[PDB]
Amino acid sequence: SMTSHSWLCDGRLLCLHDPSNKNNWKIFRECWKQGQPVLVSGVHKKLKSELWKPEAFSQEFGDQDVDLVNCRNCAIISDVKVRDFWDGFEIICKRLRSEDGQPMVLKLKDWPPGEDFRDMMPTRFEDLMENLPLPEYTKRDGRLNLASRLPSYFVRPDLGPKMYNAYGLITAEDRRVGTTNLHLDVSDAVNVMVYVGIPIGEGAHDEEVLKTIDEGDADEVTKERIHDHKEKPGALWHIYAAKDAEKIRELLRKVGEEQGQENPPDHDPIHDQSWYLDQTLRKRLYEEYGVQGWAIVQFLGDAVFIPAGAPHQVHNLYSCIKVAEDFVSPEHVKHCFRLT
Ligand SMILES: NNC(=O)[C@@H]1CC[C@H](c2ccc(Cl)cc2)O1
Ligand SMILES: [Cl-]
Ligand SMILES: [Cl-]
Ligand SMILES: [Cl-]
Ligand SMILES: [Cl-]
Ligand SMILES: [Mn+2]
Fold first, then answer.
1. Is 242 near ligand 1, meaning CB less than 6 Å away?
2. What is the sign, positive or negative, of the torsion defined by CA atoms of 32, 37, 38, 43?
3. Where, in this chain's numbering, is Fe cation bound?
4. CA distances from 20 to 37, 144, 305 (A)
C-alpha cells in the first residue's frame, strides 16, 4: 500500500514517500528541529528524464574547457574539454587512463562554474526548482527560507543550484576514498540524485557494490532496498550531527599526529576537507569519542536534506549526476551568524 513515510537508520532517519504531498511539513519539521537529516524518495518521477542524461550534456556543452580530479590520488587534470569527462561516464573503454593504464575514476570540478547554472541551463533550472520537495523551505523565495531576508551579520549562500558530477568508485582499495571529503556548510542544503549511470562494459563490478554498503554500516531496511534490486543506488553518505563537529575535529587531530602530520593544536581538519572516514576511522569515532552518524544510501530520485553545521562525506557507488540547492531554515539560522 502507498504510505506517507517510513523510517531508515533503525528509526533515526525520516523517509518521506511523496515529494509533492502538501502535508509533508507536518512530519518533517519535528525531525528537522532535532538536527536530523531527512530523505525524500521519488523526485525522478516529477522531472523531464531527457534533460538529465550524460549524452545531452556532452552534445550541448562538450566544447567547454574544465578541470577534473583523479579521485584515487587527488591529481588535477587541467584545461580539458568537458566531453572528455561525459563520453566516459558509462562507457569504461572511453575513460582517460592513468600511467598504470587503468581507466581513472574522475570528478568534474566546479561545472557549471560559480553561480552560472541558471544562465547556462534555464530549462534544467526550471525543471529542478519547480519539483524540489518541502518548497516553503527550499524555493529561493519560500516563506521558511530566510536566505533573501537576512542582514550582513549572517553568511548568505551563493545563488544555486550547483551540479555535482563524478564516476563511481570501483575497487576494494577505492572503498577507503571519498568522492567529496568530510566537510560542513553553514547553510542547509537539499541534494537530489537526478541520474545514475551503471556500466555493463567493464560491468561485473556490481558484486563489490554489495560489500561496500555492508562495510559502510547501512541498516537492514536500506539493504532490503539494495537486496530487492529494483532501484539504482547512486552514492553512500555519512552525516554527523552539528553538535558532534568538535569531537570529530579532536579525532582527526589525533590521527593527523599519529600519521606524522605537523599541525598546530587549533587547526581545523573539517574545514581543510582533506579526510574521508573509512570503516576503521568510523569505528574509532564511535568507540573512542561516543559519536554515531547516519549511513545513507542515496538512490535515483532521492533528495538528501543536510542540516547546517552537520559534517558530511559522499562516496559514489556508480556514476552520479546530483543537483543541490542551499537554503536558510529558521531552525538552523544560528549556524551562519557572524558573532559569539
Ligand atoms: N536498471 N539497470 C540496472 O543495472 C539495475 C537497476 C538497479 C540495479 C542494482 C541494484 C543493487 C546493486 Cl548492489 C547493484 C545494481 O542495477
Ligand atoms: Cl542545530
Ligand atoms: Cl537547459
Ligand atoms: Cl513545505
Ligand atoms: Cl572534496
Ligand atoms: Mn556539502
1. no
2. positive
3. 183, 185, 312
4. 19, 17, 15
**Is 223's C-beta closer than 6 angstroms to any atom of ligand 1?**
no
Q: Cα–chain-centroid distance for residue 74?
A: 18
Q: Can you give the resolution of this entry in Å?
A: 1.5
Q: Count Cα neighbours of 27 within 13 Å in the Cβ-side half-sphere.
A: 22
Q: How far is the CA of 68 from the centre of ligand 5 (A)?
A: 12
Write the residue with the smallest CA distance to atom 6 of ligand 1.
232
Q: From ligand 6's centre to the CA of 313, what distance in Å?
A: 8
If DSSP codes are grouped into helix, strand and coil, which group holds residue 113? coil
Tell me how far the alpha carbon of residue 35 lies from the centroid of ligand 2, in angstroms. 5
Q: Rounded to an integer, what distance in angstroms lies between the CA atom of residue 104 and that of residue 30?
A: 43
Q: d(Cα 269, Cα 263) in Å, to the nearest integer?
A: 10
Please tell me the number of the ligand nearest to residue 23's CA. 4
C-alpha cell at 327: 537554503
The C-alpha atoms of residue 124 and residue 142 are separated, in whole angstroms, by: 20
* Spatial separation of the C-alpha atoms in residues 272 and 181, rounded to whole Å: 9
| C-alpha span between 76 and 107 (Å, rounded) | 10
Task: Name residues whose C-beta falls within 8 Å of residue 27's C-beta, 6 or more positions apart in sequence.
Answer: 4, 5, 14, 16
Number of domains in the chain: 1
Please report, for the domain that includes residue 176, its CATH number: 2.60.120.650
> Which domain does 201 fall in, by range?
1-340
Is residue 66 within 8 A of residue 81, CB to CB? The reply is yes
Query: For ligand 1, is residue 229 a contact (CB within 6 Å)?
Result: yes
Task: For residue 212, give the H/E element and its range.
Answer: helix 206-215
Ion ligand 4, residues whose Cβ is below 5 A away: 25, 134, 136
